[PDB]
Amino acid sequence: GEFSVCDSVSVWVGDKTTATDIKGKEVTVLAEVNINNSVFRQYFFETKCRASNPVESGCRGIDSKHWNSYCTTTHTFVKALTTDEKQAAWRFIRIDTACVCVLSRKA
Amino acid sequence: GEFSVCDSVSVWVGDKTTATDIKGKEVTVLAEVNINNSVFRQYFFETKCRASNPVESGCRGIDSKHWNSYCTTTHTFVKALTTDEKQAAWRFIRIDTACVCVLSRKA
């Protein structure tokens, strides 16, 4: 049947406490946002790698005879209400969204 | 050097007009949100496949002798201000976030 090259794990996250923002700083993630007198809990759908090597040689199916590989998590950016040592603001934060295979040549 | 198995293309999108929501319906994406008397244009960072077959056999580096492959775009969910035939609301919409390789056995 069909299976990815890198095994992946997805979960809805409703209790996030810190995240790295687009500018690289660590920021605190607030839990509920009120947008116009009504509140929302902030949720993030994240997908992570289950393993950098789901198989001993790296990613599944790769041609190991020529290639080296491992799986790695890639990120999107989602704006969220956050706060830092001085200011609460909507900021863009890095969220984990996929597990992909990266290759290079064996020598 | 390091290269992905599936070639990928990322862009910030600031003029999105429709999106499919989590419930599957097509919805209209509004452009500016006012959260507390101040406005924001809504942006989405999307990553798409450049090709289902970046190489003639499917994804790069796969062992084609045993495997069939192609690249496919995976989605995250981002909440955005949207509207439908009756109601403007924050809804979760499907955003394209990665290009990953899917395998199956050749016979």
From Swiss-Prot, chains A, B:
Residues noted as binding a 1-acyl-sn-glycero-3-phospho-(1D-myo-inositol) in the record, renumbered to the chain: R41, Y43, K79
Binding sites annotated in the UniProt record for a 1-acyl-sn-glycero-3-phospho-L-serine: R41, K79
Gene Ontology cellular component annotations, sorted alphabetically: endoplasmic reticulum lumen; endosome lumen; extracellular region; extracellular space
GO biological process terms on file: axon extension; circadian rhythm; extrinsic apoptotic signaling pathway in absence of ligand; extrinsic apoptotic signaling pathway via death domain receptors; negative regulation of neuron apoptotic process; nerve growth factor signaling pathway; neuron apoptotic process; neuron projection development
GO molecular function, one term: nerve growth factor receptor binding
Tissue: Detected in submaxillary gland (at protein level). Highly expressed in male submaxillary gland. Levels are much lower in female submaxillary gland.
Record bears the keyword Ribosomal protein: no
Induction of its expression: Expression oscillates in a circadian manner in the suprachiasmatic nucleus (SCN) of the brain.
Coiled coil: none
Main location: secreted
The entry's keywords: Cleavage on pair of basic residues, Disulfide bond, Endosome, Glycoprotein, Growth factor, Lipid-binding, Metalloenzyme inhibitor, Metalloprotease inhibitor, Protease inhibitor, Secreted, Signal
Disulfide bonds: C6-C71, C49-C99, C59-C101
Localization annotation: Secreted; Endosome lumen
Function: Nerve growth factor is important for the development and maintenance of the sympathetic and sensory nervous systems. Extracellular ligand for the NTRK1 and NGFR receptors, activates cellular signaling cascades to regulate neuronal proliferation, differentiation and survival. The immature NGF precursor (proNGF) functions as a ligand for the heterodimeric receptor formed by SORCS2 and NGFR, and activates cellular signaling cascades that lead to inactivation of RAC1 and/or RAC2, reorganization of the actin cytoskeleton and neuronal growth cone collapse.
Stated family: Belongs to the NGF-beta family.
Subunit record text: Homodimer. The homodimer interacts with a single NTRK1 chain. The homodimer interacts with a single NGFR chain. The NGF dimer interacts with a single SORCS2 chain (via extracellular domain). The NGF precursor (proNGF) binds to a receptor complex formed by SORT1 and NGFR, which leads to NGF endocytosis. Both mature NGF and the immature NGF precursor (proNGF) interact with SORCS2 and with the heterodimer formed by SORCS2 and NGFR (via extracellular domains). The NGF precursor (proNGF) has much higher affinity for SORCS2 than mature NGF.
UniProt protein name: Beta-nerve growth factor
Native source species: Mus musculus (Mouse)
Gene: Ngf
Residues of the full protein shown: 131 to 237 of 241
